[PDB]
Amino acid sequence: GLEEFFDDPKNWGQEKVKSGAAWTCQQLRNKSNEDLHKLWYVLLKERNMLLTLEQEAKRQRLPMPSPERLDKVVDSMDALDKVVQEREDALRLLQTGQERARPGAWRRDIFGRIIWHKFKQWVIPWHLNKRYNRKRFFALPYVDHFLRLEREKRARIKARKENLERKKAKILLKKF
Amino acid sequence: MARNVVYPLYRLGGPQLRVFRTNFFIQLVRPGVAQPEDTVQFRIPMEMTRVDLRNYLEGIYNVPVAAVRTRVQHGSNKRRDHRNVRIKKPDYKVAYVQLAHG
Amino acid sequence: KARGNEYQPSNIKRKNKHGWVRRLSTPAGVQVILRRMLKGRKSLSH
Amino acid sequence: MKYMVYPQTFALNADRWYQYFTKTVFLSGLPAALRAVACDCLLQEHFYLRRRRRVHRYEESEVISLPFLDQLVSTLVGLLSPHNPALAAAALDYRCPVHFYWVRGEEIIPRGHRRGRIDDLRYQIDDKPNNQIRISKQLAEFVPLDYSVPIEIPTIKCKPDKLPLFKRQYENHIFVGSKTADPCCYGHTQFHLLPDKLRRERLLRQNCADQIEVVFRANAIASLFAWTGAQAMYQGFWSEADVTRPFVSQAVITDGKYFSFFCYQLNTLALTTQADQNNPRKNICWGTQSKPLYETIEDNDVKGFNDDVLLQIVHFLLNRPK
């Protein structure tokens, strides 16, 4: 129930609730899938409790008892997500040989930049799709000058960063 | 339901959309105004549907839920920093869950 | 009569007139967006 | 700006909130050819009338249940007109509006340029009962004006807007179903069919078994208070000139299969704060729990016809003015 959104009533106002170390990614790799599913839900209920407590601390203009608990539960579930995604990535690379889960393509644009178009899910094919054929994956010849000017600006910024690098080095060698 | 993930398209006659590890995280919030006795107020993500808050609260917390209503609360963009650039307080979803079985 | 009240706002008009899709609909408007990206503007269209 | 009140509502415990808004005490209970005709009405709409278009179940409450209800009312008014001689001169209406506007309580305006100022809490019930029989002479008075009822009306520690209730500013109407020039101003029995949104099946799917009777009771209280107060204001009674005689009206509310029976008695229109400062008159609503009329309709026959539910329809309609 909602008593699981709140803490233990004996911890209310205890100014510090001790804790334990966040789950390390190697330990989560040692555990199996089903246990990682169940631990995901255990950690989810703990994170909901901690977020509820932090918002009520803000409401009452009092410090949260121990925010390290919220930080460590976020790290624990990030590590769990990492472990499960590594296992799926390994199986996908083994079975299909594809290194991404979503299809996509390197394409050009109406602006002449090369982008990674991530694919969308459709029911009709692309030649019959209206909106898709309204989009332009090609740059007509009036984009090349703006591409050249964009490259030149990037060169003007890099040359500045590297000259300052050398000026700063000489000022350091002036002092020491 | 989950955030920031592509959903598999459903074509009629297809399997149930099942989520296994949801990244939906909610906060129970004290109501600012007076509410009835059956009302529990939550702060939920923008991409969480009232059908999914009901399913979330009845699957993970085993809370019988009779009604769910939601609204979108706007955060202020009025505040400005030292550069006169407006600072945006975020937008969130508020949900009012009316419990079941009295 | 008295002037200055020449902006009579309408969101449909502001998006039909100076929005992204109209800009991309003409090649000259594409170059308007390209000119604004080169300048580094934070609001390329309306 | 007034609260729109819907008798047929999705909001939980709306019977208690409507009991507050209308100052009503709910009290449980009440204060062969007919069978054949009722079974004919059900089986005419469920099996016999060949329907060209496939009836989807979202349309069933409007294609099947509604024609059964007004056909049943028409036939059972025609056949009981021998025994009740007022039903021959009664006026039977199909889907006519019944509006009521009233003021109950005060608030202080919380924000804006009008902040800190007294504002009346106005409510408007907008109803359209499926059927309604209106007589030209008032019925009897069930219980006497100044009845006791040691029960006490529900109160809320919360703004009326919390049970989903919203505000709008439209035309304030006070109508009985016809204008003020109709000779048939008094109300007899109303007949209501609950919509498809508020079915027993959906209200069991949404964890609201407790609220199957709630929506029946709330529809009763709101609809009968609206019709009965409209009648009083047609006779010229308002909050500062209250009713000298009690105004009554009865109502059957149904889902197609389950029927509930209600009787309301308006004893007061003094619901504003100034007129309710020392008013002891409390409006009353008696009612019964829902009961099925039939069990299933298998091909050409009704399995479980409950003759008790019909005998109650017959007695309501057999109520007559003195």
Place this chain on the structure above:
Amino acid sequence: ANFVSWKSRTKYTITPVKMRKSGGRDHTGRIRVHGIGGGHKQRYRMIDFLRFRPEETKSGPFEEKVIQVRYDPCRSADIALVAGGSRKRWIIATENMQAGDTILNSNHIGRMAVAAREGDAHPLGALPVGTLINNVESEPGRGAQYIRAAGTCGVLLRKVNGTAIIQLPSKRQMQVLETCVATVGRVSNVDHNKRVIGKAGRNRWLGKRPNSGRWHRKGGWAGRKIRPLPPMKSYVK
């Protein structure tokens, strides 16, 4: 601009079709014709200008009953709702076309000429020399483009070879083949040229925007010009 023409429907009907005015503007949105704008909203009653049009699955000459003679906003003539078999259509009413009448649409060219009854569509080779004719085609089966405005009549003047020569209301002679179809008589509303607008507002109701205020000096084109009549126009190859 985005100007789609309202003239989109592809099926004949007697239902009045909602028109869309132009303002004198082309598909580019620029004015092409000055003086057009803002009259009463008008609906279009489609006119069948091919009088000899046998109904699908029928072949020869056929009769139609005149049911109504109505006002048309879109032209200066009255229109006639007629019906034969299972088909109702709008035609151009002749001068004395009355409701409840019977008119014949024929394609037969006999050795003799026919007694030309008003309102009846006959071939010009079936008509007598001297018949007042309305709604004429330039080629056999093209439909009526000429003599269509109110009170206008042309004259069969000569039947020669397989050609029939006519006098068009501008007094101009026009030669066609004898198989072309022409209605007999004068178009209805013969007093249409005696109408008095009476009012600049009535002209704006008809949808005529006012003339320009700019003064123009008259040119060499301007005086009276007594030209010879143009030569006979032939549509017979």
Place this chain on the structure above:
Amino acid sequence: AYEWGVRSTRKSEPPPLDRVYEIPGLEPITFAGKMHFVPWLARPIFPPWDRGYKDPRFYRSPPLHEHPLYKDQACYIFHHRCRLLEGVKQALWLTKTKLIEGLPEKVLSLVDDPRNHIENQDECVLNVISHARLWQTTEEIPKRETYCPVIVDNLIQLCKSQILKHPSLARRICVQNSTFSATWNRESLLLQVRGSGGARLSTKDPLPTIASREEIEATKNHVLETFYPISPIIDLHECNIYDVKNDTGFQEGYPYPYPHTLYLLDKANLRPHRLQPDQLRAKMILFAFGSALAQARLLYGNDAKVLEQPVVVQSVGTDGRVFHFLVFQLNTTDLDCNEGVKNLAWVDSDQLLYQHFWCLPVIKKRVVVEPVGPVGFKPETFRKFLALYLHGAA
């Protein structure tokens, strides 16, 4: 001739094909592999596509000739929205019927007797008119789509109030949303009546016959009137995808199987959308014929014969102010020839119930000229309504 639809509104042809498709032996290079259009590569030829599975919101029906119930012969269908050009006499030709002006003396006599009248009858009908046209809704002037069915329902209930005097009005019911069907041949033309909308006064007892068998055989000398050049089927849907089944509208075993009065309403708020009186009478005639035929075919078979027991169906048709009354007697189902016994129809047409209603006082020159209420009430019209209602039980 002039052809409808201009080129600028007619869809354009695709661009001319790339010449590389006419050069034999060549594999054209298209943008099909890029999955996006490129202006500098050839436009591919995409093969035709099909879903394969049935999505109901994206369905495409089969071509019309490949439909199961497709027949090369046309069936001309009369439904509630058909508006006959020739009206009553076209209906009389299409149903093989002789028309008699006025109602039967049997019916007009059931109310000539004055114990069959309603108590305070004229004031009760005036109250019905006033409730329908003024007192009904919150609107000051109620519209026709509301007042017409309201006035018909309240007249039916006011007539139904005589169950005190006649305890055989309990064998009746007024059915809505009932649809009947009847098909017959008529000079080698297949006609169908699909009857829908209105109310069906359904009874347990067949209506008694009106004309004697001597009058029925006396009908064998009235030539049906024809209306050349108009085809008898001018305004009936020429359908080519149809079925031929009779239908009374009710499955077998309905307690109230006999049609007594069909109540037809011209409810439309606009005069072009309302039927002319002749067209309304024609609609009543073909609907009464359809109900009578459906009953005759149900009980007596699909055979063609002069009916030994004729079938009587009445119909009242109104817009709310004018009423028309019809009694129809099916004397035969042998209809393909125009010779022999004809059906009969007694018609009382264009009976006003009131000339006008004033929903607001007419105050010209600060003095009330016309008072509020009905103008020109006709209790004779109401008496004909009651007589048709009490036919069969009075």
Place this chain on the structure above:
Amino acid sequence: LGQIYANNDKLSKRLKKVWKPQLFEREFYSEILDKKFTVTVTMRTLDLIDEAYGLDFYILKTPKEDLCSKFGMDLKRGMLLRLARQDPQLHPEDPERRAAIYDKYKEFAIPEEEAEWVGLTLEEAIEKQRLLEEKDPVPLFKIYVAELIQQLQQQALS
């Protein structure tokens, strides 16, 4: 597209002038491909074909810069491929004509691998190379199965 001087007078107005060719639509038969082609040509192409003694000879001798036609260079590629594969579809029932018309144009025979790229513009060539190098990825299951088997062969040898 160029400019002129009013009436051959440099002290007069310089005006803009465009000179366009006389364009004629005509039909040609190509012996190698066996197809009639309706082509808009100039009177120059007609003589250039008369001097070539045939449309196929004009197409196969004239290079890109003087052909000035994407249609011409695609025609050249198709003609040159039918020749490289001795396509048995040129007059399929009549190999003696097939051999004779192939022997007439034997001198322009180039290898098929250098004929598949004749007349291709760079975008079409880039698409051709991408389509021939597409190669949907191979499973690491198969890769590691081959690896495990090779190492187990070495262990079985030892």
Place this chain on the structure above:
Amino acid sequence: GADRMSKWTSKRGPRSFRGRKGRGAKGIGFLTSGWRFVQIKEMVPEFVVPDLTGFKLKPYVSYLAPESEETPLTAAQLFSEAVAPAIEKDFKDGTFDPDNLEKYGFEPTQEGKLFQLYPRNFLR
């Protein structure tokens, strides 16, 4: 002028604009007839929540735990720890058919599967 620097939300613009834009919640059905919404259950995400009675894993780890070196799982490790025993134990016995790798786990196609790894058709 108008504010062209803040985010375009569904709170701005006229009625039609406000109702046609949303906040990013995925659809759980379609719209038909009189703007009537049909919810499709299979398009509603079902939360697959396990039984947590008898579970010994708590949200935090004790600090008295030995430190472990990080080792990201690779496809090489998955092959060496999932199918390599079977392949070795079938080669030493001598019954490896190099054409039926389907028995060792290899999925030729991902079609016909309920949880296809490319293109991914399953939620997290």
Place this chain on the structure above:
RNA sequence: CCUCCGCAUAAGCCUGCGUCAGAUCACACUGACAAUUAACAGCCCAAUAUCUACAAUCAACCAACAAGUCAUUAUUACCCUCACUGUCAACCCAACACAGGCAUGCUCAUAAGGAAAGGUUAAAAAAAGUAAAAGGAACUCGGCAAAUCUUACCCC
């Protein structure tokens, strides 16, 4: 004492006088914490063919002209639900807490909404009114203004 206002919707704007804490004409400022909950409104609809002459005006009588804003049928296809979004304010366009501009419904007559005087004195000149003996256009370019409420006639 004023009320030529007001309350809603639309459009526009986007937290812009809610609570707590805090400074330095007179005390809507800064930071924090909250809030607008759908039934109103938005967001619609399988195909192919086919159908659709008869205004509106209390629609009756009656007269029109400029000739009009509201309609189907046949046969296939079709199981399921109450999702998503707007909802606050003393508010928008005019550089401004601008005597300006601003669509519609109700109240238009108030049950809503508001304050012309910071305090004094009571000079000139100036502004806005009110009264004025006798006279009554003598004024002035002109009866402008004001007051009355008023005749006849040129030119265009």
Place this chain on the structure above:
RNA sequence: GCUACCUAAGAACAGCUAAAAGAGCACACCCGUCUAUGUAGCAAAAUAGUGGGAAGAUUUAUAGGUAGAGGCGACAAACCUA
């Protein structure tokens, strides 16, 4: 997004005269005759009074169109973002 003209589909017009009106009186509403005040103003064209119209070639909300060697104009060489 002002304004000039147009397209689509909308909305408003009390009361009195006479009942026929690009009719008269007259609100709302649209305009702007004359006077005074104001002239860095409340206002980069306003205010008060007085006026012209107010069922019409009227006024007006919304979306769209025509763009500068142009557009649009009941010609003021008007108007096309003070």
Place this chain on the structure above:
RNA sequence: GCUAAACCUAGCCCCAAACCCACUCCACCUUACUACCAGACAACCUUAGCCAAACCAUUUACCCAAAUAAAGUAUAGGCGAUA
């Protein structure tokens, strides 16, 4: 003695060298930053003018493939300006 005044560091400029920049997830050409539906449209045309010629009307230098030199030469040009 108030207001003030002072200040060296952000960084920048010209060169040299050297071939510069794009897939956490999700969203984004529709009213961009919008999970999800029957289409298809599609790129290529000599700059001109200010200015100089003391007006202006032909004419009036504009990187085009490492320096230098031939050479401001041959040539061109209202045989003028200039090129």
